[PDB]
């Protein structure tokens, strides 16, 4: 029997933005968010609008809505989030 | 000299008490241009002897008289620069290999301090002489052996690493601060700061990841001093490294809060504490592209942390690093003698041993998926620390490699560490660092070349060489071969072209 | 794009020693109209991944290919401008209030310093690209907080004041 106690590891993070992709759901912006991907029968597939910030960044509206409940900073670029489009 | 200064003082008071005030300058000028300027050759001939002898008062009088002469001073400047250069060569090239960085920096500091004191005291602190001293010391610290190496940046980086690492010899914080403040004076003349920057980045990574720093405030002070030495673009990578290592504590706290706020109990079973670093500003790289298999009890934690970093951060792929990864493991299989710190490469084969005492090389290969070189390195490290014993006839690596655990391990240390690759410094990776420095040099030279050509579109070879030397002087000293290779690279990418009328002139594609 | 540049460079050589010198342009131009100008939809789709990861090798090969086609550049101009504007915003923000002026001017200059040093070595200082950089930094310098006023002129005012004041720190 061997038991591991500490695993202090090193992780490298780099920007992985792909074109026309939700940075939170990691899928296409036009499709439903991963929160609304499940229980698609309940979801009307119309409320997942593409919210555009002042930094010309695209998230699903549900995604940025859940994001704003914890922090008021855009995840892609560390600025305060301001809606401009719908 | 004594008679000339005495007679000059007498003539000064004489013309002040006799002539009109408007003629004092003319009387002094004609009392020096026909007194020491006419005999300037003799003074210049005796200048080298009077400088090398380092007689104080005579040198001061000689400096006064040569400052009086319009064209008598530069010869003394050259003599003093040559003397300081020779003194530095004889005070640095005799150093030994037992301790090269510390003693080298100490000798350069002592020579610089003595000469600055002499210049301030018996030379009136002329800026020409200070510039001569700077040029001489620049030639001293860059004592490049012919066409082979340049040991100054490596030595200075090793010096910083030795003084900032948490050592049992004993150095207090304030002594470290004043020693570094004196060190910046030495660093201000390297003319090869790219090599030092890369070596300091490597040593900062080695110090920060393993937690060998004595205090983060010391690292921040050192980085601020480097920033004031060169600029923000010199220390942006280092500052990002230090910022990431500071915010690692907040990230660990956020991860712990996230895994304590989940709907179900994750039960990682390990003391998890991550060191997420920015990929753009750390000198680490995924050069060992060998695929590694995470053990399952760590696979759970890797999956949980991946989900966390995809949730509370966005658009950040998480390139895991394993050859820096390490941690503590327990060994209650043989009676729990102690707890061993171990890298995850060796931890994988340790868990493979935990699966079964009898294990072959093929089983390690299919359980870890890692390449032969890294697996062989881990195996030889384990047998070198006598963690395992080779059951084959020969103890080296072979195709079969059948072996089991060594039950004779009874080390006295209760927290014995089986990894000691904190210094490393293999000549291969140093050559890789040199090659990366050369590539950055080629990028910088190409940037300057294309900028100049876009500015003017017509230059000769000599002017291009001179402007490349001048513009890149704050970074390095480029060679003709490097600039020729860069212009040939721009030729190959159909970006630059020479003039058809003359190969000396160049054009735009 | 590596294999295209191998063919395009060869096609200049092959048409040189085989054809009349008056047809050098027409063969190469129709070469591009079947190899790079017929894959603008493919090249612009993969242009986004090239600029974001700053692959100097592939960005150079994208530039020489897309320079030949008339419409090849204007999508890459918009892509680099979106990258600089993003890369600028990381540098300007997340800055402590103790040293906001010096860190701000350094961060925008560092982004400008690095990207000018990247445009010249890869895009060869194309004035179309330099306008894309200047447009992008104009958005990040004049970036504004929600329901607030732009803090750029006040911040540079303190920086040039801190730099010019009597300071003993070197
Ligand atoms: Zn989404
Ligand atoms: Zn939704
Ligand atoms: Zn954004």
UniProtKB/Swiss-Prot annotation, chain A:
GO terms, biological process: cellular response to amino acid stimulus; cellular response to chemical stress; cellular response to oxidative stress; cellular response to UV; DNA damage response; MAPK cascade; negative regulation of canonical Wnt signaling pathway; negative regulation of insulin receptor signaling pathway
Reaction catalysis annotation: S-ubiquitinyl-[E2 ubiquitin-conjugating enzyme]-L-cysteine + [acceptor protein]-L-lysine = [E2 ubiquitin-conjugating enzyme]-L-cysteine + N(6)-ubiquitinyl-[acceptor protein]-L-lysine; S-[NEDD8-protein]-yl-[E2 NEDD8-conjugating enzyme]-L-cysteine + [cullin]-L-lysine = [E2 NEDD8-conjugating enzyme]-L-cysteine + N(6)-[NEDD8-protein]-yl-[cullin]-L-lysine
List of residues binding Zn(2+) 1: 22, 25, 60, 63
EC top class named in words: transferase
A GO CC term assigned to this protein in UniProt: cytoplasm
Pathway(s): Protein modification; protein ubiquitination; Protein modification; protein neddylation
Keywords assigned by UniProt, alphabetized: Acetylation, Cytoplasm, DNA damage, DNA repair, Host-virus interaction, Metal-binding, Nucleus, Phosphoprotein, Transferase, Ubl conjugation pathway, Zinc, Zinc-finger
Localization, UniProt: Cytoplasm; Nucleus
Tissues expressing the protein: Widely expressed.
Known EC number: 2.3.2.27, 2.3.2.32
Impact when changing residue 36 to A: Strong reduction in ligase activity
Binding site for Zn(2+) 2: 33, 36, 48, 62
Keyword Phosphoprotein recorded: yes
ZnF (RING-type) ranges: 33-78
Domain notes: The RING-type zinc finger domain is essential for ubiquitin ligase activity. It coordinates an additional third zinc ion.
Family: Belongs to the RING-box family.
Protein name: E3 ubiquitin-protein ligase RBX1
Gene: RBX1
Shown residues in whole-protein numbering: 21 to 106 of 108
UniProtKB/Swiss-Prot annotation, chain B:
Residue(s) carrying N6-acetyllysine: 158
GO molecular function, one term: ubiquitin ligase complex scaffold activity
Effect ascribed to mutating residue 484 to R: No effect on conjugation with NEDD8
Chain positions of cross-link Glycyl lysine isopeptide (Lys-Gly) (interchain with G-Cter in NEDD8): 454
Subcellular location: Nucleus
GO biological process: G1/S transition of mitotic cell cycle; intrinsic apoptotic signaling pathway; protein ubiquitination; SCF-dependent proteasomal ubiquitin-dependent protein catabolic process; ubiquitin-dependent protein catabolic process via the C-end degron rule pathway
One annotated Gene Ontology cellular component of this protein: Cul2-RING ubiquitin ligase complex
Pathway membership: Protein modification; protein ubiquitination
Entry keyword Nucleus: yes
Modified residues (Phosphothreonine): 426
Post-translational modification: Neddylated; which enhances the ubiquitination activity of ECS (Elongin BC-CUL2/5-SOCS-box protein) E3 ubiquitin-protein ligase complexes. Neddylation leads to structural rearrangment in the complex that allows interaction between the E2 ubiquitin-conjugating enzyme and the acceptor ubiquitin. CBC(VHL) complex formation seems to promote neddylation. Deneddylated via its interaction with the COP9 signalosome (CSN) complex.
Superkingdom: Eukaryota
UniProt keyword terms in alphabetical order: Acetylation, Host-virus interaction, Isopeptide bond, Nucleus, Phosphoprotein, Ubl conjugation, Ubl conjugation pathway
Signal sequence range: none
Domain Cullin neddylation: 440-500
Complex formation: Component of multiple Cul2-RING (CRL2) E3 ubiquitin-protein ligase complexes consisting of CUL2, Elongin BC (ELOB and ELOC), RBX1 and a variable substrate-specific adapter; this complex is also known as ECS (Elongin BC-CUL2/5-SOCS-box protein) complex and may consist of CUL2 or CUL5. Component of a ECS(VHL) or CBC(VHL) complex containing CUL2, RBX1, ELOB, ELOC and VHL. Component of the ECS(MED8) complex with the probable substrate recognition component MED8. (Microbial infection) Interacts with human respiratory syncytial virus (HRSV) protein NS1.
Family statement: Belongs to the cullin family.
Name of this chain's protein: Cullin-2
Organism: Homo sapiens (Human)
Gene: CUL2
UniProtKB/Swiss-Prot annotation, chain C:
Subcellular location: Nucleus
N6-acetyllysine sites (modified residues): 158
PTM notes: Neddylated; which enhances the ubiquitination activity of ECS (Elongin BC-CUL2/5-SOCS-box protein) E3 ubiquitin-protein ligase complexes. Neddylation leads to structural rearrangment in the complex that allows interaction between the E2 ubiquitin-conjugating enzyme and the acceptor ubiquitin. CBC(VHL) complex formation seems to promote neddylation. Deneddylated via its interaction with the COP9 signalosome (CSN) complex.
Subunit-structure text: Component of multiple Cul2-RING (CRL2) E3 ubiquitin-protein ligase complexes consisting of CUL2, Elongin BC (ELOB and ELOC), RBX1 and a variable substrate-specific adapter; this complex is also known as ECS (Elongin BC-CUL2/5-SOCS-box protein) complex and may consist of CUL2 or CUL5. Component of a ECS(VHL) or CBC(VHL) complex containing CUL2, RBX1, ELOB, ELOC and VHL. Component of the ECS(MED8) complex with the probable substrate recognition component MED8.
Entry's free-text remark on domains: The Cullin neddylation domain restrains the RING domain of RBX1 in the E3 ubiquitin-protein ligase complex; this restraint is removed upon neddylation of the cullin.
Function: Core component of multiple cullin-RING-based ECS (ElonginB/C-CUL2/5-SOCS-box protein) E3 ubiquitin-protein ligase complexes, which mediate the ubiquitination of target proteins. CUL2 serves as a rigid scaffold in the complex and may contribute to catalysis through positioning of the substrate and the E2 ubiquitin-conjugating enzyme. The E3 ubiquitin-protein ligase activity of the complex is dependent on the neddylation of the cullin subunit and is inhibited by the association of the deneddylated cullin subunit with TIP120A/CAND1.
Family recorded in the similarity comment: Belongs to the cullin family.
Protein name: Cullin-2
Provenance organism: Homo sapiens
Gene: CUL2
Full protein stretch here: 236 to 405 of 745
